[PDB]
């Protein structure tokens, strides 16, 4: 298994949907690892895997709430209006 990189530096150049899905996948992976350890130990899962389940729950709630905007006439108009050639050049020039 492999956890995704969701650090601030990695998250900076990522779309919201990808970041949310990666967080959800990481939570699921951690939950299944904890459940596997619990099964190996033989102890009940609820007494060990509650917090990981809650993390999966909260990541699900954040993931399902976001709907990426549809690309339509008004949305495209807004995007083109804000991101003019001058603004694009200024953004490219800025080093920050």
């Amino acid at each position: 298994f492999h956890f995704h990189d969701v650090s601030n530096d990695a998250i900076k150049g990522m779309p919201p949907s990808e970041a949310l899905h990666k967080h959800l996948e990481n939570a699921q992976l951690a939950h299944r690892i904890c459940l596997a350890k619990a099964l190996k130990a033989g102890e009940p899962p609820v007494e060990k895997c509650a917090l990981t389940w809650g993390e999966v729950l909260i990541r699900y709630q954040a993931w399902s709430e976001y709907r990426p905007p549809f690309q339509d006439s008004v949305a495209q108009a807004k995007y083109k209006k804000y991101w003019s050639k001058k603004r694009q050049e200024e953004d490219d020039k800025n080093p920050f």
Partner: protein, 168 residues
């Protein structure tokens, strides 16, 4: 029939699970918004008409008489035409509670009726949808309970880059 009580749960669930909102559902909601604005406009027009009809004769003479703000000539012609039309026949001109009732009750009834039947229309629209939202609506009307996490239970479609979770 009271559709709002059924629909409030569905709307809250859709907000919580808005990720699975297809463009068809978005168009449905936009149509609902447009029809709400239309109902507001027509109700306001009715209210203005009732207010004008029940207005006192002296009030109309002051409102639609001299002076003219612009004095273009069309303004005066229109004001005189409306004043003559209103003051020609006899009009019931109540005051106080009576004018309140006459001007408001028709407006309230019209707005409420239009909105209620548009809510019924939206419920039917969501019933006819072939998306996960439509399935949730049908299940809600069948079992009477909102089944959360339905999109991940029946494995509703996801983008090509997010199907790993269904990989089981």
């Amino acid at each position: 029939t009271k559709y709002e009580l059924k629909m409030q749960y569905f709307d809250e669930w859709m907000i919580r699970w808005r990720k699975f909102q297809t463009e068809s559902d978005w168009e449905i909601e936009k149509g609902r918004q447009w029809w709400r604005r239309f109902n507001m406009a027509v109700s306001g027009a009715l209210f203005c008409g009732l207010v004008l009809y029940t207005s006192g004769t002296a009030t109309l003479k002051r409102q639609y008489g001299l002076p003219h703000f612009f004095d273009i000539g069309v303004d005066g012609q229109a004001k005189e035409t409306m004043l003559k039309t209103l003051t020609s026949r006899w009009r019931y001109t109540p005051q106080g509670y009576g004018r309140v009732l006459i001007t408001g009750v028709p407006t309230y009834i019209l707005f409420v009726t239009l909105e209620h039947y548009r809510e019924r229309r939206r419920m039917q629209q969501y019933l006819q949808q072939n998306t996960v939202f439509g399935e949730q609506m049908r299940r809600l009307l069948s079992t009477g309970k909102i089944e959360e996490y339905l999109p991940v239970n029946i494995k509703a479609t996801l983008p090509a880059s997010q199907q790993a979770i269904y990989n089981y």
